[PDB]
Amino acid sequence: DRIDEIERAITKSRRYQTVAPATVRRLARAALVAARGDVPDAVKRTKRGLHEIYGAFLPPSPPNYAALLRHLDSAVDAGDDEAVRAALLRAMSVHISTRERLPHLDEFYRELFRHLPRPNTLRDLACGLNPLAAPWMGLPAETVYIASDIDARLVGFVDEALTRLNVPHRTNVADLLEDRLDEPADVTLLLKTLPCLETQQRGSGWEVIDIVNSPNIVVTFPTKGMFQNYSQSFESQARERSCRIQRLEIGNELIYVIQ
Ligand SMILES: C[S@@+](CC[C@H](N)C(=O)[O-])C[C@H]1O[C@@H](n2cnc3c(N)ncnc32)[C@H](O)[C@@H]1O
C-alpha cells in the first residue's frame, strides 16, 4: 500500500518517470523500512538511491532523444558513414559513462575483441549508451546484440539506434539484482557496473558474474586511488575462485576478461 504511494511519487515528473518498476519497488521497500514507515522520507531515500545508481549519469531532465535520433536518421538516410559515427558519438556523450570512454573508443573495442572469440550473441548488461558503439566492435554480420538497463526510455533509444544501424538485436528493461541471466550468450559485457551493484547489494557483483550464462565475461572499473581499490579487491576475489582472467587498462578503464 505504502509502496504504491512511493512508486507514484517516483513516477518522478523529472529524472525517474520511466525507471524499471522492479527497481523502484525494490528500492522503495528497503527505503520504507529504513524510513521507519514515513513515506515522505522514504520517497527521499528512494530518490537519492536512484540518483546514485542512475540519475548521477544522466541529465536533470529526460535527454532529448528525439534530436539525437533525428541526427542519426540524417546520417543514415544520407549513407554517410562519417556522419553516422559523429551522430553516435554525440548521442553517447549524453550518458556520463559512455562519455568517459569516447576518447579511447576505437582502441578499447579493437583490443577487447582480440581477446574474445567471434560472438554469435553479445549481451550488454546495465548497458547505458554503450550499444551505440559496435560499429567500432566489428561484430560478425549475424551477431545478435542483447542489451538491457534500468530505464525504459534509455533502452528504447538504444533499440531505435540499433534498428537504424541494422544490428540484429533484442532490448529489455532488466534489473541485474532480480531478473534472470540464464539465457545463453557467448559474451557478456559488465562495463563499469560492479561498483554500483555493490552499493545497492553487497556481494551482488560476483554473484552476477557467477550466474550469468556466458563463458566469456568482460568486467570493467573506472579509474577516474580508484585503480588501487578496484584491482585489489576484484583480483583477490578472482584468485579466491581460481577464475581465469586477463587484465587490460585502456583510457580511464580497468578491464578484466573472464573465461
Ligand atoms: C556507471 S554506469 C555504466 C554504463 C555502461 N555499461 C557503460 O559503461 O558506458 C552505470 C549503469 O548501471 C546501471 N544500473 C544501475 N543499477 C542497475 C541494476 N540494478 N540493474 C541494471 N542496471 C543498473 C545504470 O542504469 C547505469 O547506466
For the chain, what is the total number of helices (H) and then of strands (E)? 11, 7
Q: How far is the CA of 71 from the centre of ligand 1 (A)?
A: 25
CATH of domain 58-259: 3.40.50.150
**How was this structure obtained?**
X-ray
Q: 3-state DSSP call for residue 61?
A: coil
Unique residue bearing C-alpha cell 562495463: 191
Q: How far is the CA of 232 from the centre of ligand 1 (A)?
A: 22
Please give all residues whose beta carbon lies within 6 A of any atom in ligand 1, as ranges.
53-54, 57, 97-98, 126-128, 130, 149-150, 175-177, 191-193, 196, 200
- C-alpha cell recorded at residue 169: 538485436
Pocket test for ligand 1, best of 25, 193, 223, 252 (most atoms within 8 A of CB): 193
Q: How far is the CA of 78 from the centre of ligand 1 (A)?
A: 33
- Own/partner long-range contacts of 153-156 (Cβ < 8 Å, ≥24 apart): 153/18, 153/62, 153/63, 153/65, 154/18, 154/58, 154/63, 154/95, 154/128, 154/129, 155/127, 156/65
The contacts of residue 211 (CB under 8 Å, 6+ apart) are: 181, 182
The answer to the question of whether 101 is labelled as a binding residue is: yes
Residue nearest to atom 4 of ligand 1 (CA): 128
38 within 8 A of 192, measured Cβ to Cβ: no
Pocket test for ligand 1, best of 50, 54, 200 (most atoms within 8 A of CB): 54
The candidate with the shortest Cα–Cα distance to 158, out of 194, 125, 114, 182, is 125
* Alpha helices for 128-251 (secondary structure H): 152-164, 194-200, 204-211, 226-241
Separation CA 170–CA 161 (nearest Å): 12
Q: How far is the CA of 125 from the centre of ligand 1 (A)?
A: 7
Separation CA 114–CA 177 (nearest Å): 30
Q: For the chain, what's the residue count? A: 259
DSSP per residue, 72-115: HHHHHTTT-HHHHHHHHHHHHTTSHHHHHHGGGHHHHHHHHGGG
Q: How far is the CA of 181 from the centre of ligand 1 (A)?
A: 16
Residue nearest to atom 20 of ligand 1 (CA): 175
DSSP per residue, 120-160: SEEEETT-TTGGG--TTTT--TTPEEEEEESBHHHHHHHHH
* Domain 1-57 belongs in CATH node 1.10.540.10: no
Separation CA 126–CA 177 (nearest Å): 11
Q: How far is the CA of 77 from the centre of ligand 1 (A)?
A: 31
The answer to the question of whether 95 is labelled as a binding residue is: yes
What are the boundaries of each domain within the chain? 1-57, 58-259
The answer to the question of whether 176 is labelled as a binding residue is: yes
Residue nearest to atom 11 of ligand 1 (CA): 126
The contacts of residue 207 (CB under 8 Å, 6+ apart) are: none
